[PDB]
Amino acid sequence: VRAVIGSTYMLTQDEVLWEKELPPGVEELLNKGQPRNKTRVVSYRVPHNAAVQVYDYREKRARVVFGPELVSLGPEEQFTV
Amino acid sequence: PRNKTRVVSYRVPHNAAVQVYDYREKRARVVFGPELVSLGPEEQFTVLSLSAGRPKRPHARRALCLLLGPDFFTDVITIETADHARLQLQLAYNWHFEVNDRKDPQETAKLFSVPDFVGDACKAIASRVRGAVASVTFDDFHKNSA
Amino acid sequence: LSLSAGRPKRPHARRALCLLLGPDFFTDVITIETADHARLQLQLAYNWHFEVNDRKDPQETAKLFSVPDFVGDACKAIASRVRGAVASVTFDDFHKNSARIIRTAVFGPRPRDQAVFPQNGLVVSSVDVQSVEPVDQRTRDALQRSVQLAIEITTNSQEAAAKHEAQRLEQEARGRLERQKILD
Amino acid sequence: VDQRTRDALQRSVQLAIEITTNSQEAAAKHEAQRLEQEARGRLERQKILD
Structure with a gap:
């Protein structure tokens, strides 16, 4: 599974859309901070003077994103609640 | 319902640890921090049974992971002063697990040795406070309790 | 194994295929009596573990299972030491020193930091007193009057201190006024 | 074995608490005095300085 980001895309013969499930509390916090199309890349607009912690459970890479930024999650990344 | 044929996996929280034992390879492992822990055919999670609530009742919470990071648990204890005044004291204790080397098998297995760290620390500290205040009068205690 | 369980520690209440070895604690509720006959219900928790020097020694290891009920033996043994020490102590001296009296009674009189049971290698490392209470309400009512008298003592001490500063x-003021009249 | 013997001991307990209550009030009385x-000794001196 991989995130295809930034350009008009045609699914090659081997590919299908994959639905990203989120913990039962996270899906509401994305709407409060704004039905979700589960196949679209999950993104959050970080406020000014705030930080978000994300963990990549596949690449095993931790990241904290500061300030106003758009944070998008990879297939196995998750937000810290 | 869980598909029993799919590999069992758990997303370990940040500042937490999980203890797994391989009952076939006979290899013990503790997994720290944010990580995905998957179980082999005969591996099993260690299940903690912990004290919970304000009066701290035993076996009230169950967990697959030991939370390690700086946190606090509240406890309500009844104590008695030297002049017999009986006081209900509400406390909160800040706690964390100190780990010197996350690669040491013996230090790391030691974290899971006590079956209920919450219940033990609350029960231990309450007895020290009760023991000290029993030798102090209520007027001296009220002005110096902190 | 057939082991003692519950807060009053009844025998044969739990059965198990495995002896838990690691650091843990069992609670016990014991009734004791002081030198002046005040009868107190004392709640205790004892931290214990089995000390094993060599996990490959057949004799040291077989020794762990020799006692049929280690919980029942250790609770019964320690309760008798606490009851035996407190019977020689008055209720006022006991109330103000209970944590030190119990620690000394259990570990001993030779000072030590732990109690070892050599029959199976069980070690008790602490006694944490949870509470102490008179068994009869008529004894609690007598102590509740002592609390009221201690607060009245504190109230009187406050008024007496206020009276002394007022005077x-x-x-x-009076001494300065008397002087000013003479200067006028 | 007999309750009549326990009641006699329970009276000794009450008297031991009253002994402790009296001992407490007597200590408060001695510090109040x-x-x-x-205070009185300092006030008597201050009147002479005034």
Whole structure:
């Protein structure tokens, strides 16, 4: 599974859309901070003077994103609640 | 319902640890921090049974992971002063697990040795406070309790 | 194994295929009596673990299972030491020193930091007193009057201190006024 | 074995608490008298300085 980001895309013969499930509390916090199309890349607009912690459970890479930024999650990344 | 044929996996929280034992390879492992822990055919999670609530009742919470990071648990204890005044004291204790080397098998297995760290620390500290205040009068205690 | 369980520690209440070895604690509720006959219900928790020197020694290891009920033996043994020590102590001396009296009674009189049971290698490392209470309400009512009298003592001490400063300020004003009349 | 013997011991318990209550009030009385005299002795001196 991989995130295809930034350009008009045609699914090659081997590919299908994959639905990203989120913990039962996270899906509401994305709407409060704004039905979700589960196949679209999950993104959050970080406020000014705030930080978000994300963990990549596949690449095993931790990241904290500061300030106003758009944070998008990879297939196995998750937000810290 | 869980598909029993799919590999069992758990997303370990940040500042937490999980203890797994391989009952076939006979290899013990503790997994720290944010990580995905998957179980082999005969591996099993260690299940903690912990004290919970304000009066701290035993076996009230169950967990697959030991939370390690700086946190606090509240406890309500009844104590008695030297002049017999009986006081209900509400406390909160800040706690964390100190780990010197996350690669040491013996230090790391030691974290899971006590079956209920919450219940033990609350029960231990309450007895020290009760023991000290029993030798102090209520007027001296009220002005110096902190 | 057939082991003792519950807060009053009844025998044969739990059965198990495995002896838990690691650091843990069992609670016990014991009734004791002081030198002046005050009868107290004392709640205790004892931290314990089995000390094993060599996990490959057949004799040291077989020794762990020799006692049929280690919980029942250790609770019964320690309760008798606490009851035996407190029977020689008055209720006032006991109330103010209970944590030290119990620690000394259990570990001993030779000072030590732990109690070892050599029959199976069980070690008790602490006694944490949870509470102490008179068994009869008529004994609690007598202590509740002592609390009221201790608060009245504290209230009187406050008024007496206020009275002494009022007299000091009154005299300090009066002495300056008496002088000023002579200067006028 | 007999309740009539336990009641006799329960009276000794009540008297031991009253003994402790009296011992407490007597100590408060002795400190009140010490402080009262310590105030009075300083006031008597201040009147002579005034």
